[PDB]
Design a protein around this ligand. Structure first.
Ligand SMILES: C=CC(=O)N1CCC[C@@H]1c1cccc(CC(=O)Nc2cccc(Cl)c2)c1
Length: 185
């Protein structure tokens, strides 16, 4: 099936816990995959204008690990619940992709998660201004704008344009390559 094929592809890139004990300031992100209309989509948030770091920007759900988290996957799931109401039974964590190093002392670990078809986002307005889907295939032929390369995605439901950039854009491309490369039609 489409979903069984996605997970099998993703598993080949799972680094697991290889890098998880290293003594960094640790954050985790969830790359949430949603199946709609026969196709895979990624779910993105728009960060609240209130927030200190990067108000109003497109981001994946996630945040800083805390002492309650059993592991890095737990951080991602705790934060996704807080931000968009995603509950643990509504997500299967399929793998841990390549961690992102920033600022010399910070390590951000990305987890890809398959989201239940009945999940409906409840944006928490103190953290998240908006939630939207992008078809995964968009990231193979994005509308590129230079400001370094920025993606512009216009939701055909409502005509709203979102800008996706930086590691958010990078991770999205990675996931699209993993799952969609070399597929019969
Ligand atoms: C910054 C954009 C991005 O997607 N990436 C992936 C790698 C780098 C960066 C990131 C750094 C550190 C935490 C996070 C995840 C987070 O903080 N989400 C978030 C969303 C919406 C409300 C809130 Cl409160 C948080 C992400």
């Amino acid at each position: 099936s489409m979903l069984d094929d996605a997970k099998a592809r993703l598993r080949k890139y799972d680094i697991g816990g290889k890098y998880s004990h290293l003594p960094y300031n640790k954050y985790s992100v969830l790359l949430p995959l949603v199946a709609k209309e026969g196709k895979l989509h990624l779910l993105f948030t728009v960060r609240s204008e209130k927030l200190r770091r990067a108000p109003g920007e497109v981001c994946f759900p996630g945040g800083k690990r805390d002492p309650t988290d059993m592991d890095d996957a737990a951080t991602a799931l705790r934060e996704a619940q807080e931000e968009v109401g995603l509950r643990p039974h509504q997500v299967e964590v399929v793998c841990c992709l390549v961690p992102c190093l920033i600022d010399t002392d910070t390590l951000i670990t990305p987890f890809v998660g398959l989201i239940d078809h009945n999940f409906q986002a409840q944006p928490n307005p103190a953290e998240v201004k908006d939630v939207f889907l992008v078809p995964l295939a968009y990231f193979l032929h994005p509308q590129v704008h230079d400001q370094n390369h920025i993606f512009e995605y216009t939701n055909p439901e409502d005509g709203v344009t979102y800008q996706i950039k930086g590691m958010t854009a990078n991770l999205a491309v990675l996931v699209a390559f993993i799952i969609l490369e070399k597929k019969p039609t």
